Design a protein around this ligand. Sequence first.
Ligand SMILES: Nc1ncnc2c1ncn2[C@@H]1O[C@H](COP(=O)(O)OP(=O)(O)OP(O)(O)=S)[C@@H](O)[C@H]1O
Ligand SMILES: Nc1ncnc2c1ncn2[C@@H]1O[C@H](COP(=O)(O)OP(=O)(O)OP(O)(O)=S)[C@@H](O)[C@H]1O
Ligand SMILES: [Mg+2]
Lengths: 804, 802
Amino acid sequence: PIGDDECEQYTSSVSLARMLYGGDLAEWVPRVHPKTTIERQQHGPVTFPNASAPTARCVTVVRAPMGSGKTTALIRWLREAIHSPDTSVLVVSCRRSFTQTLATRFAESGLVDFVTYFSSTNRPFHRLIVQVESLHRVGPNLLNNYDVLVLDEVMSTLGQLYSPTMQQLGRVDALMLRLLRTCPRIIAMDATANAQLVDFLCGLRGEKNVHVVVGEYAMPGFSARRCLFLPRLGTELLQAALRPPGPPSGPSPDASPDARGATFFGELEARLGGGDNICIFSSTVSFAEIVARFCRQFTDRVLLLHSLTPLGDVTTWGQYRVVIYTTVVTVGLSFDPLHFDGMFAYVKPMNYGPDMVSVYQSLGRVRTLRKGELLIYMDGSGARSEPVFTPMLLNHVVSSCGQWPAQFSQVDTSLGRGSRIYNKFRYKHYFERCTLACLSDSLNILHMLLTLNCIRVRFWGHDDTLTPKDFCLFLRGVHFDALRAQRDLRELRCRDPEASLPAQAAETEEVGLFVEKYLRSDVAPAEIVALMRNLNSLMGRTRFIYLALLEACLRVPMATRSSAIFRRIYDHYATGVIPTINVTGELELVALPPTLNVTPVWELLCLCSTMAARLHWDSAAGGSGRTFGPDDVLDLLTPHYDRYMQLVFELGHCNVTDGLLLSEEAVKRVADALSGCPPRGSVSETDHAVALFKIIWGELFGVQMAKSTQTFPGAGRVKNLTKQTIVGLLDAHHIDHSACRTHRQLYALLMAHKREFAGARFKLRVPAWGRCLRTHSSSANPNADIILEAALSELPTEAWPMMQ
Amino acid sequence: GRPIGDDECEQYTSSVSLARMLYGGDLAEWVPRVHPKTTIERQQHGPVTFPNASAPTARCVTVVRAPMGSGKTTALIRWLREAIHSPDTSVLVVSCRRSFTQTLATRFAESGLVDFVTYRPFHRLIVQVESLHRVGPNLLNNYDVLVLDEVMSTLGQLYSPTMQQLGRVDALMLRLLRTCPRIIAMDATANAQLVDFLCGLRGEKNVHVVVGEYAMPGFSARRCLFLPRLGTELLQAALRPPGPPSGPSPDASPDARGATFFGELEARLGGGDNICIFSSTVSFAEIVARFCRQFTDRVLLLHSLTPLGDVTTWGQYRVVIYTTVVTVGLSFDPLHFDGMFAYVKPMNYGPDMVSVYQSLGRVRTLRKGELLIYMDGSGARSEPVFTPMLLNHVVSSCGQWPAQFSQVTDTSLGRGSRIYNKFRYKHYFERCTLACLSDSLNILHMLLTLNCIRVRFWGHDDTLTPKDFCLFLRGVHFDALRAQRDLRELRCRDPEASLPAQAAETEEVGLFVEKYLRSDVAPAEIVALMRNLNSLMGRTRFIYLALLEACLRVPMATRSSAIFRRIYDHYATGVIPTINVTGELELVALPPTLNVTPVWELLCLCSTMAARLHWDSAAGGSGRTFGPDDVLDLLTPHYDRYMQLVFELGHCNVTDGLLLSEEAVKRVADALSGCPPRGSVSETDHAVALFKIIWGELFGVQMAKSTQTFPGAGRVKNLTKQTIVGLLDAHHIDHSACRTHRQLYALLMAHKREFAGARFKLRVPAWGRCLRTHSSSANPNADIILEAALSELPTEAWPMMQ
DNA sequence: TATTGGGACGAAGTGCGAACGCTT
DNA sequence: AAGCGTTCGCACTTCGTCCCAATA
Ligand SMILES: Nc1ncnc2c1ncn2[C@@H]1O[C@H](COP(=O)(O)OP(=O)(O)OP(O)(O)=S)[C@@H](O)[C@H]1O
Ligand SMILES: Nc1ncnc2c1ncn2[C@@H]1O[C@H](COP(=O)(O)OP(=O)(O)OP(O)(O)=S)[C@@H](O)[C@H]1O
Ligand SMILES: [Mg+2]
């Protein structure tokens, strides 16, 4: 059955997909803002207003397809809008492609230059072209006046702000809100400019001054393209091909009438066998490596491009007969020649993957396809949840003046925030990442982005039109016909020498969720696989979890003091599930068991956190920032020396071998290590203290007390002596001082006296992995875990059994 | 011996100096240093008395930091009879404590038309500040005179978990402070940050400060003595069971530093004295009662679960043990008690040293002027909180406080606006210092000393150097480490009494109440929950029910797998307390399941059908009636997967952990086996047979047959709004008679026989009704902060385009 | 059969003259 | 605008772990 809800749910899903990308702009703008005029340009390349006459409005905002001549229309308009040779202008881009292109492509203008590296002068800057992420180092030189302003891919330009790669955001936001107050004329343009951008520009220069252009033409490469969403993956034809041949008789009994739906690997076979040239988008690497291993049976001259392969220019694609690629082509350049006969795409919505806008910008990287084909498969395994674009959202968004909620719905404890610019467009980054949780919604977003570029999207069977029934009956197929095939992509998965294990590991959800919690977000997958290989062994798990608790008790200093708070930290970091790679190269989950009595662990991190602070510990910076002699080690331990001796002894043979950290192997290592320690009083304190220090750091956390070459103490080498830091090394050792004021002479004094600073020194070095945990210095955008640590350090423990 | 040197002198010197600055021990030193224009006076003889209210020298706003026991309210009577002229003059008096709401309206005889808290004409009104959200919007906008009695307590109850309309009560208080011309404020621990806040809003020249230095004999001129030893070796010999008393031992031969609590108690109680005993914990109050019962029969106990007696009931008894209940009751005035003992214990979920201080002053005058205090540091082992790094940062910055221990700045919770933000530091350092014994001890030593009482530590008759304090401190830390063993082999042993007070003191149980439950709960209903929670089925039903409510609070969790791992790992893993059948408390682990999809796919179904109902586990089960007509409409929209999961969960190949455990999967398979196949049976009757197993086995919530005469509300003794007219046209026929709601009910009394059908409601069992749920209201814990994060932050792409 | 002592190479620092930034 | 306070390119080497080949 249809189930009643599906008419309302489909029609809501399609309507919000249309609204978020501005598919309704020709109806909404003349209804809600009568003082704004709107242009529809229904044929031929786009054209802007008159570039010189006084009758044109000063703010014009353009929604116009990918591949419709927009750079040519901007060239035609900018050469006029620069009114005089003294007129000065600024151009902003999100994408790298225009920073290289526009400065090279403008021939109708002079003194134009790309992003600033070495031209710094003091100030001359006009006709500057910039990547928005780099704007912070250029801002002071702009002098805060321009006569003309241009934004292309403006929803990407205001969309870069949400990405973790932008830094010093608030000061760049405060500059963006300085240009945009219509000191210049403004032109703003995108393929998906929307109602909320037209509204926001009214909020900077009023309804009277805003003009809207809507383009509905795109080049033959797109307007003749005939996308088709297939019903079934066809892995049974893959298993007959990529594997060695099956038995001479007894094939699979299912799907004998083709299951009345053409299949991706079935259709791919025909074009490669017919001698066509072809190209293959793949949103995940694990399928890219599989379809490479398939294609070499039909045509040996395959190419494969993904984020761990080396740099290769798009001009090289003329030689190869199959080119396979992932979303790395977004930051590349268009393939302008005519070569490929058609195109295939495996799109897979998943929680840590690409947005459907990022897929659409990658499909468009080959311009003309000779037959006009394109076949897309949407793999619904891993995205089969209840929808996000509900009729409960539609009624709210359509009753309001087109304004969206800032969360999943209306509301309230929240972060500090940027300006009106950052907060106005936060709704779009939210729903671009929520909708990946559903295969409908994701399919209706992708279906919109294609249908806004004239691409005649079709399903299987339904050559022309679909009712709500026809659509809902289609997804009851691809939800099941994908899931029952998914097991094949575990058997076929690469264990050959070509296998990109660092890429195929990181693709999983379980690794994504570990990287979010424990590590720095900028780690290379190659260093995660060096870590996850250690965390398989029970000793390796133990050291990593002790070192994660040491870092947390430095970040949250209240954890060293209240026992109630340390239970909340221990339950969050040192319990649950981790991913690990076993001796075979397969990836397996491991459960970390809880412990009832955390007291023996807490007393030992409580006595190590104060001994780490005093050595300027930061595991992201390699280890201890300060060198110590053996006498300094004695001075670290001496205040609590008998208590270090007690707690190192107790963990050798605890009452119960509970949880992870007091497990049977973990207790044995410390009991073993105590056999090599000199007995108390048999050797000098400066020796016994070193012998105990090396055991408590060495077995629990794994960190070595290495020698170091530093010819003066503290953090600084001889290259970084300063007029301040010299004096501390004149006070100690009582050097004669009374020197000449000039630092050249203070250096020459110590380089004569350097023999005073002979003698042994040590430094703590962290073990190769573990140099990538999120330490106290390693700042990043807030995740849910950084919020929880900010909660523990700010809210006090309020009393329970109360007189009200 | 043990080394001390001078390394630890900064710890004491910082600790004592920060304690001083928090409670205002440096008014009339800091004021000339930082605000020279503000006038200051010292009163050192007899009662305090405020400046004349009638003269031209009646400047603006006055703040008073007079001791307890120095005549605050009588000096206010003198000042207010000079401040009130003609009856048209306008006044308001604010109190935090209940005691003045009863007292002042009864005690004022020099004035008329005065009244206590309200249950347009309003003047001479006296109010509890916890009523200000009801009272405030009914008041006139400005008054000629304003009294803030116990001001630091008045804007102190403002931080209470049960406070209402906080975002407007901050603004109401600010409006009164901004434009009332004459104001007086009177807390015995007023401080420099209240001086600064009023100097900010009214100007440095305007404010005047009164500092009291004398308090009446007996009331606040005792001889407080701290003792170094509890003396439990005497206790466990004294509480010897029947038979022989047993012989002495040579371990008693040491000097015991010359004094012990149980020794100095016994020597006076045997010597004929009548003795109160305060105890911060009930588990010690119930022991020291038994130690007196063998010496005399006239022994009371008054802990928080007993019926509260009026203090005139005391004075019959030889002993009257009590525990912080007297925070909200009247003070005992008669000269009955010879002396008094206290046991104070810093605890992370216990009462703070200012709440302990005003519990010791609830007995007023003593026949020999003595008071002996023991600080049990056994659960305050930790490193100091009042560090020199905090002292330097505060003292360098004009004495401004940082309001968190990190000294660093981003959750903008901001429930108030300005008063809430200015004073937030005080509640934070009042709770944090209970983590440590030295810092709790130096606060309590200050609060006694800044109220005239001479404080001594036993054996140090003249004065303490930092080293002398550090010797006494490490001593009493060792005493409480040893003596705590005796207090565990001794116990109440449950004479059919006080299990909830013995349970509730445990820090493991506080952690359970703040994570899962409503903070409204009494100890009595925690015990019967934790006693159920010991059974393996009980603890499985509880955690399925806790997860169902989180799936209604966070609506992304029912649709993102990455989000449901954050919720599952938090509400369904880790350690919980339980009560064993033996009558003792035991911790039990919830082990981490590797694969959660079998659970997520079930909650994803239950939290959609629970939203077709109005499910609300604190208010009932279902807020809505339903029947076998409706149950078909619950199951049939998504039936293709409901058919599998309840059967398949009973037949899984492997058992990852609790929610899929060997006991649970057999139990659900056995229960489900009574369901027919889809053949030779009614679809509705098959549907409801399945429905009772899904809800009944896994969540523990049964059906009950409807007593409602109509759908929704349907009692007939009295009518309720819209419940008749909202059904009167639902039968698709017109009555045309009348529109007045009440008398129309007779029309539905015809329809009752054709509205009829089999109708039911889900109901939550007696243990389940104290969960924190989506309909509830409370102040933010770390967990409500987390659920705001999971719902408001989207999930970023990780293997990124680097 | 008997088990370890010698060689390679990552990686963090030495020390000369110098470069950048600044204000006589 | 010459003297001058942080910071460094380059050629050199010292520490510790990996590995193997020559003994037994
Ligand atoms: N590097 C280039 N060389 C030549 N023409 C280019 C180049 N980059 C862009 N174009 C122009 O781009 C037009 C395609 O339509 P447009 O809407 O202008 O594409 P666009 O929005 O610039 O897309 P891209 O992704 O930036 S090429 C072509 O007709 C070209 O004239
Ligand atoms: N509860 C009370 N019972 C009797 N007299 C009281 C009481 N409270 C105040 N007084 C009178 O006011 C003075 C004592 O008040 P203080 O101890 O200085 O401060 P207070 O806060 O008013 O006392 P409390 O807290 O109300 S017991 C004496 O003159 C008493 O006669
Ligand atoms: Mg463009």
